[PDB]
């Protein structure tokens, strides 16, 4: 019902948890992928300034 579409890009060499020195290669997942999630939280940040 007039849903919002979000463009997504996929990587295979990832650097999670600030890890400078170790990079992981995700092997190719064979087939078509589909997962349905519950977004339950957000992490926001103000811009501040002289307003």
């Amino acid at each position: 019902n007039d849903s919002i579409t979000l463009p997504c890009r996929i990587k295979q060499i990832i650097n999670m948890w600030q890890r400078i020195g170790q990079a992981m290669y995700a092997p190719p997942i064979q087939g078509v992928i589909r997962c349905v999630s519950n977004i339950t939280g957000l992490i926001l940040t103000r811009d501040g300034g002289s307003t």
Epitope: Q18, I20, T45, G48, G49, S50
Partner: antibody, heavy 122, light 101 residues
Framework: QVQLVQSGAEVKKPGASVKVSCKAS????????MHWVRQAPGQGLEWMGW????????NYAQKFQGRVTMTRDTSISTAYMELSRLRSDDTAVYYC???????????????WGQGTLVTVSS | SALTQPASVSGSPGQSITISCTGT?????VSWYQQHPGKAPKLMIY???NRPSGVSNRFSGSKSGNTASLTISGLQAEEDADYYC?????FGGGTKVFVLG
């Protein structure tokens, strides 16, 4: 022995761009945010925005939202401040500040750079 | 510029001086900076009263309500500079401290 070294004086045209360097030394560069404060000649301090060297996430002030782009280089431990479309009032000494080692929070700029002077020509 | 600082405060060599920083609203933690002309600012007082290392004990801070104050006892000839009070991201207009006769 926290050392903050900025770039040399810059002279740019109105509407052009200028990128200010800020090389850090004496601590872990990827553990503390990096702020940017400018000061017009004869005026007071003005906070522009902080950048987190970890992920690169910045926080530009609402006054410069859409003009300043803050990046960093973890390999050489140097943060950058680029201001696009320079106006006549942008002539100022641009400092890069860092929070205190203590108190586990920001907003206590103990370490400052020598400053970079930008001019408006005109 | 939500923090109001006096444009000029005078003092004589030896006596004490006081810089008041009145900020609108603001209900905790305040900071003070000293900037000599041609140099970068220097953190003198953080969190109202605490003092970093190694600024002289002659500098002390206080706050009551919407008014924070910086007290400098025993003024010298090198003490005169620009003084700014800080709250979160905001800065004051600045206070020029004079130590002339």
């Amino acid at each position: 022995q926290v050392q903050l070294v900025q770039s040399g004086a810059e002279v740019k045209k109105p509407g052009a761009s200028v990128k200010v360097s800020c090389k850090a030394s004496g601590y872990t560069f990827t553990g503390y945010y990096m702020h940017w404060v400018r000061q017009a000649p004869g005026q007071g301090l003005e906070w522009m925005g902080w950048i987190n060297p970890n992920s690169g996430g910045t926080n530009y002030a609402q006054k410069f939202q859409g003009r300043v782009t803050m990046t960093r280089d973890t390999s050489i431990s140097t943060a950058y401040m680029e201001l696009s479309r320079l106006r006549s009032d942008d002539t100022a000494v641009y400092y890069c500040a860092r929070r205190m080692r203590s108190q586990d929070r920001e907003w206590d700029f103990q370490h400052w750079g020598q400053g970079t002077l930008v001019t408006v020509s005109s | 510029s939500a923090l109001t600082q006096p444009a000029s405060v005078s003092g004589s060599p030896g006596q004490s001086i006081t810089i008041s920083c009145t900020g609108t609203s603001s209900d905790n933690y305040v900071s003070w900076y000293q900037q000599h002309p041609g140099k970068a600012p220097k953190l003198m007082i953080y969190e109202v009263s605490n003092r970093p290392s190694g600024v002289s004990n002659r500098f002390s801070g206080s706050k009551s309500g919407n008014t924070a104050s910086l007290t400098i006892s025993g003024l010298q000839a090198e003490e005169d500079a620009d003084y700014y009070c800080s709250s979160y991201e905001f800065f004051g207009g600045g206070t020029k401290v004079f130590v002339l006769g």
